[PDB]
């Protein structure tokens, strides 16, 4: 069942940009052209193509994200990607994934909660000290995402301050970046030498303990990088956007305290509605494949919009309303298939604690600026730049 070729559309001015927490109207106009379109603009140029496909309907995004038969996420050049699990295809992906799995179980996460609760409490103390107009993004969301990652890797408490600073620097000139990189790499080598010598219980220690000489230091450093890139800004973005979204839909705040089951639904509904990883790694076709009446040719790239897929009426009724009371559905906020977020259980747990502790301590939380004044970061993961609040 083949249709006319999807029409070439010029990339809209506000392609991938938002209006408050939502996709900018330009993205809905593009979606109105069909589940699969072809776009020409900055995206295709950046990928060295005349055009790129954009899958933005729910069914097609779920299908492509999970299809590792017809698509690869390997960069087309390599050593700079060693251990970057999201860019591996099976069988290599499978090996790295199995090394990570054991450290992300709910059992391991629960044991981590006291330290996470304590981090959240400390950052809210600072928010409270700052008083009215305090930047919730910079004082609470950002450091919670950064320090939670530090805890997961097992970064010494006294090194975290500097480590988070490094995390944000490489995130000033190529020469300065080369220096930050050299320093970060030196730090990781010393950290790994210590773990190889006497493995502790952290994520790195557990992998050294379980695989030892079956995993290289290059892979371990790449895995560290993958977790930092995959978990710091995403958590920070969910906290910031989640706060904005709950403040704009206050009736949802009480559901957070209704029951453990309802609180988990609020967190999953926020991930669906917000989808901070709006567009994951582009999928490069390695075999021709027919999808929804279009022929995607080997060599073509397909951008998958998780954000627009999760706003599809095909997924749920009134998808543009934040409503944790809707029947749970299989959204693609954490992805789908072999690359499904390895950190999903941890994110769900940290986000529930972050939001609940925040409203227990500042029940009268209120945005301190007009919603239209809030600015948003331009990066691989969507995230508010500053979120001034009062209470």
Question: Which segment (185-193, 209-217, 232-240, 312-320) binds ligand HEM by CB under 6 A?
Answer: 232-240
Residue 175 has a CB neighbour count (10 Å cut-off) of 7
Report the candidate in 243, 237, 275, 274 with the shortest Cα–Cα distance to residue 378. 237
Contact (CB, 8 A) for 127 and 139: yes
Q: 338-342, long-range: CB within 8 Å, 24+ apart, which pairs?
A: 338/66, 338/68, 338/90, 338/93, 338/94, 338/97, 339/65, 339/73, 339/85, 339/86, 339/93, 339/280, 341/230, 342/85, 342/97, 342/100, 342/101, 342/104, 342/230
Tell me which of 24, 33, 74, 97 binds ligand HEM, using CB under 6 A: 97
C-beta closer to ligand HEM: residue 35 or 242: 242
Each residue 341-380 as x (binds ligand HEM by CB under 6 A) or -, in order, gives: xxx--xx---------------------------------
Question: Which segment (129-137, 270-278, 295-303, 355-363) binds ligand HEM by CB under 6 A?
Answer: 270-278
Distance, in Å, from the CA atom of 300 to the CA atom of 121, rounded to the nearest integer, reads: 48
Tell me which of 234, 268, 316, 349 binds ligand HEM, using CB under 6 A: 234
**SS3 state at 332:** coil
Contact (CB, 8 A) for 61 and 312: no
Which residues in 41-158 belong to E strands, given as ranges?
52-55, 71-72, 134-135
Instruction: Tell me if 150 is assigned to a ligand binding site.
Output: no
Residue 255 Cβ vs ligand HEM, minimum distance, rounded to whole Å: 18
C-beta closer to ligand HEM: residue 134 or 235: 235
Residue 228 Cβ vs ligand HEM, minimum distance, rounded to whole Å: 8
C-beta closer to ligand HEM: residue 231 or 240: 231
Each residue 53-72 as x (binds ligand HEM by CB under 6 A) or -, in order, gives: ------------x-------
Each residue 305-344 as x (binds ligand HEM by CB under 6 A) or -, in order, gives: -x--------------------------xxx---x-xxx-
Q: What does the DSSP assignment read for 16-66?
A: T-EETTEEPHHHHHHHTT-SEEEEESHHHHHTTSS-EEEE-SHHHHHHHHH
Q: Is 301 in the site for ligand HEM (CB under 6 A)?
A: no
Residue 267 Cβ vs ligand HEM, minimum distance, rounded to whole Å: 8
Report the interface residues with ligand HEM, using CB under 6 A: 65, 85-86, 97, 152, 226-227, 230-231, 234-235, 238, 271, 276-277, 280-281, 306, 333-335, 339, 341-343, 346-347
- Which residue ranges make up the annotated binding site for heme? 341
């Amino acid at each position: 069942d083949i249709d006319q070729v999807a029409p070439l559309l010029r990339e809209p001015a506000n392609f991938q940009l938002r209006t408050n927490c939502d996709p900018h109207e330009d993205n809905f106009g593009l979606r109105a052209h069909g589940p699969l379109v072809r776009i020409v603009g900055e995206s295709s140029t950046q990928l060295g193509r005349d055009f790129v496909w954009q899958a933005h309907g729910y069914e097609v995004v779920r299908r492509i994200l999970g299809d590792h038969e017809h698509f690869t996420t390997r960069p087309q050049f390599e050593a700079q990607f060693v251990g970057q699990i999201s860019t591996y295809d099976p069988p290599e992906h499978t090996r790295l994934r199995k090394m990570l799995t054991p450290e992300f179980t709910v059992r391991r996460i629960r044991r981590m909660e006291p330290a996470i609760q304590s981090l959240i409490d400390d950052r809210l103390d600072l928010l409270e000290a700052e008083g009215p107009s305090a930047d919730l993004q910079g004082l609470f969301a950002d450091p919670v995402g950064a320090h939670a990652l530090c805890e997961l890797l097992g970064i010494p408490r006294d090194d975290q301050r500097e480590f988070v600073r490094r995390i944000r620097r490489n995130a000033r000139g190529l020469k300065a970046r080369a220096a930050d990189s050299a320093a970060f790499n030196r730090y990781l080598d010393n950290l790994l030498a210590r773990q190889r010598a006497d493995p502790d219980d952290g994520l790195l220690g557990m992998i050294v303990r379980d695989h030892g000489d079956n995993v290289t230091d290059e892979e371990l450093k790449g895995l560290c990088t993958a977790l930092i890139l995959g978990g710091v800004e995403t958590v920070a973005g969910m906290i910031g956007f989640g706060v904005l979204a709950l403040l704009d839909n206050p009736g949802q705040i009480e559901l957070l305290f209704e029951s453990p089951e309802k609180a988990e639904r609020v967190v999953n509904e926020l991930v669906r509605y917000l989808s901070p990883v709006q567009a994951p790694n582009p999928r490069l076709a390695i075999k021709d494949v027919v999808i929804d009446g279009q022929l995607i040719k080997a060599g073509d790239y397909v951008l998958c919009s998780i954000l627009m897929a999760n706003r599809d009426e095909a997924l749920t009724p009134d998808p543009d309303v934040l409503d944790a009371n809707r029947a749970a559905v299989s959204d693609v906020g954490f992805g789908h298939g072999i690359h499904y977020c390895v950190g999903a259980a941890l994110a769900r747990s940290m986000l529930r604690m972050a939001y609940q502790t925040l409203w227990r301590r500042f029940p009268g939380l209120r945005l301190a600026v007009p919603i239209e004044e809030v600015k948003y970061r331009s990066a691989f993961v969507d995230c508010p730049d500053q979120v001034p609040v009062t209470w």
